[PDB]
Each structure stands twice: as structure tokens, then as C-alpha cells.
Amino acid sequence: DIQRGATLFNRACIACHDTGGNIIQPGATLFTKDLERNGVDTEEEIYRQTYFGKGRMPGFGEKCTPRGQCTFGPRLQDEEIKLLAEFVKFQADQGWPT
Ligand code: HEC
Numbered sequence: 001d002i003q004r005g006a007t008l009f010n011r012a013c014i015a016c017h018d019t020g021g022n023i024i025q026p027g028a029t030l031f032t033k034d035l036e037r038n039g040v041d042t043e044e045e046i047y048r049q050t051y052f053g054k055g056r057m058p059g060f061g062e063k064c065t066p067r068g069q070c071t072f073g074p075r076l077q078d079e080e081i082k083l084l085a086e087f088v089k090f091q092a093d094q095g096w097p098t
Helices: 001-010 032-036 041-052 078-094
Strands: none
Touching: 001 078, 032 078, 041 078
């Protein structure tokens, strides 16, 4: 559900990945070229990074561990992270339409 994925992305991701970008770390946007260069232009890789995190990208998964590498907010359920990974892949493929 793209409507549902957009809503969840808007509240859990968009402040950092504004319209597909990255306000913290240049080179690590959600655009296809950056995802590709970073080895993560697949739903499975997007899911894994969202779940466990990397660098200053917090992990959101329920079993993300250790505590310090994960969001200090609530964790996301597996189904939510799957929706988000699908949504990011779809948007990146589409070129992040505005
Ligand atoms: C909400 C759940 C999300 C989702 C789906 C993603 N993020 Fe982030 N992200 C942030 C930073 C600093 C990075 C770079 C980390 C590094 O260089 O080691 C990332 C990276 C990603 C990717 C990979 C992008 C790439 O081109 O390699 C993906 C798929 C991704 N994120 C998804 C920063 C943040 C945040 C700032 C506090 C927040 C919030 C999020 N990300 C949230 C999400």
C-alpha cells in the first residue's frame, strides 16, 4: 500500500531523507545512483539497513542490537519495515517524484 508506505515514511524517515535525500550524510541518499554505489539498491538490502542501521543511520528493527546502534524511539514491526523497504525501492525506481 503506497499510501500507507508514504504516511509511515513521512513520519519515521523523511526528516533525514527529505524527498529521497539525506540531510546528514551526502552521498548516502535514497536515489538509485547512491543506493547502487553503496551496494543497497534492493528491497532486501534496504530492509536490512533499516532494520540494523549503519553509521549514523539508526536501526529500527525489534531485534536491532546493541541498543546504541538503534533508534532510541520505538522500534518498527517487521511488517512496517517491509512496507518501508518496498516504498523506498519503488520511489527510487521512479526517481522520487515531487
Ligand atoms: C526510516 C525508517 C528510514 C529509512 C527507510 C531509511 N532511513 Fe536512513 N540514513 C541516515 C544516514 C546518516 C545514512 C547514511 C549512513 C552511512 O553512511 O553509513 C542513511 C542511509 C540510509 C539508507 C542507505 C542509503 C545509501 O545511499 O546507502 C537507506 C536505504 C535508509 N537510510 C533508509 C540517516 C537517517 C536518519 C537520521 C536521524 C533517519 C531518521 C533515518 N535515516 C531513517 C531511515
